[PDB]
Amino acid sequence: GLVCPAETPEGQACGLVKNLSLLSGISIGSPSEPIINFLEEWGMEPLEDYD
Amino acid sequence: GHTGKKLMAQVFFGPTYYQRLRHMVDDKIHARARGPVQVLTRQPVEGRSRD
Amino acid sequence: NEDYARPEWMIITVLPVPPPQVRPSIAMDETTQGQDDLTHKLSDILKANINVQKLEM
């Protein structure tokens, strides 16, 4: 579901060149600070007081 | 078509999608008797266009 | 071999210079004529040799 199982070149590039599937997408990147804030608000304990 | 007689065996017959490829005989035919030669080795050059 | 392969000939003291047939003249663009890699390398070697001589004197 991420790359085409059938489409690939022949020769030295066989299997090393892929084509994305129709529904496939690539992540852009989001800040991780809201994730850390949500985790801390939902009771995550830090590594400083790890016993 | 030659005689108008019935064919003994029936023929699978129907429309089908076909596509023309970029591989034409007039773009690949090549012949050479005598022509340009390389400066260094004095051997015939490489390339259909360059004779 | 005494007659053909003498050991001290393995060390280079004089360098042969091949004719321009070995290193044919090249032309980068029309009238301007370039030089092959061998021509430039021989020029650099000769420049180094004349530098050695002129700094030795």
Add this chain to the structure above:
RNA sequence: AUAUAUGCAUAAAGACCAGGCU
């Protein structure tokens, strides 16, 4: 003694890089 020359009717780029062809 001739006379100036004031003129030129083919030269062959090759080496690398990338993408394809069976």
